[PDB]
Every structure is written in C-alpha cells, then in structure tokens.
Amino acid sequence: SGFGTSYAHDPKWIEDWMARKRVGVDRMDWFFRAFNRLRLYELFFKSTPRFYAFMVIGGLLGSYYWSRFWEQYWIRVNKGRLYKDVPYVYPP
Amino acid sequence: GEPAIQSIARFNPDNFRPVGYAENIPCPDTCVPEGHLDFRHTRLPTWHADRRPF
C-alpha cells in the first residue's frame, strides 16, 4: 500500500511472495539428468577443439535445415499465390 | 582559567559529534538483510544432476 507516496511499502502479497524461497525444491532436475545422458559434454564440449567442431558442424547443419523448414513454412502459407504454384496459360 | 593547551585540545574535530548520532546511525552487520535471497536459498539440492553439460 501507500503506492505513489513517500509511505510506499511492499503489499502483503509481495511480502508473502518473497517468503517462498523454494529451498530444497528442484522441479526441473529431470531435464538435466536426461540431457546429461546424451553425453554431449564427455564427447564434444569438454575438449576445446571438439567444442569448436560442434559449433562449426552444428552450425552448418543447423543453418541448412533451419532454412529448409522455413522454406516449407513459406511454401505452405502462400500456397496458390507463388509463381511455381500457378503455371501460366499462354494466350491462343 | 584553563590552560590554553587544554582548551584548544577540546576543539579537535573528533571531539564534536552530532546529537543523537549513536541512536540513529545504522550499524549494518551484513549486506543481505534477513528475508532477502542469498546462496543458502538458491543452492541446488545435493542430489541435483550436473549443470555443466547444459
């Protein structure tokens, strides 16, 4: 309360919010365990030359397929309105 | 009647303090007051999985 004055103070709900520290709780650990079973750290990240190779090779293949995906997205949104989708009929 | 050396000694800038100084100056014992988040609350449980790979 006291919003907009020199008496402004945190409301009770903001104070209750900050009383929930969630100490000891870890609800997203499952994701890290599962990611660690991919062995990306032991195989690529740990060694600098291999980390560089992951960024390069992963950026080569990622860039190509990202383009591929968004090309298909475009071909679908604009179906029937693209030059390839409407062969031209020559006048007689 | 005081000796002059004693009189001027009382006017050292250290001998003057504002009234109510000891009853008003905040004397902090920490930079993280009670109820504020710190590493004790944010530490992961000891059974957590390695966070380096991610």
Side-chain angles (χ1 to χ4, degrees):
Chain A
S1 203
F3 181 90
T5 75
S6 64
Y7 301 120
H9 58 256
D10 284 306
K12 178 62 173 171
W13 76 267
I14 296 195
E15 299 186 17
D16 304 320
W17 182 290
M18 301 198 266
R20 300 192 294 268
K21 300 297 215 290
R22 299 182 59 75
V23 177
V25 177
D26 179 356
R27 302 299 173 137
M28 277 298 325
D29 203 290
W30 62 270
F31 161 80
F32 293 108
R33 280 195 57 181
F35 186 86
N36 297 6
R37 290 285 310 283
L38 294 172
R39 313 300 169 182
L40 297 177
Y41 176 81
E42 293 90 1
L43 276 45
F44 310 143
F45 300 161
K46 193 178 178 65
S47 185
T48 296
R50 294 200 178 183
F51 186 66
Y52 287 173
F54 167 84
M55 290 180 299
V56 167
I57 293 150
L60 188 167
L61 296 171
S63 179
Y64 167 78
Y65 284 116
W66 192 265
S67 166
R68 219 72 192 84
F69 168 91
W70 289 109
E71 278 264 4
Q72 292 173 358
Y73 175 83
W74 180 286
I75 284 157
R76 174 185 64 81
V77 173
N78 298 277
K79 203 194 303 303
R81 304 174 177 281
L82 299 165
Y83 170 99
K84 71 163 189 179
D85 286 352
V86 188
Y88 180 73
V89 183
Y90 282 66
Chain B
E2 190 181 22
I5 188 173
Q6 301 303 310
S7 304
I8 195 60
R10 189 182 302 95
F11 279 72
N12 182 356
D14 303 311
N15 295 8
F16 297 83
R17 285 192 185 179
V19 296
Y21 173 92
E23 299 74 10
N24 277 314
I25 65 152
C27 300
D29 65 341
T30 180
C31 293
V32 181
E34 284 288 357
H36 291 207
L37 200 73
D38 79 308
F39 70 83
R40 294 175 296 133
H41 308 110
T42 52
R43 269 183 66 193
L44 290 164
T46 51
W47 46 258
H48 77 120
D50 213 306
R51 310 293 160 109
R52 293 182 295 167
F54 184 71

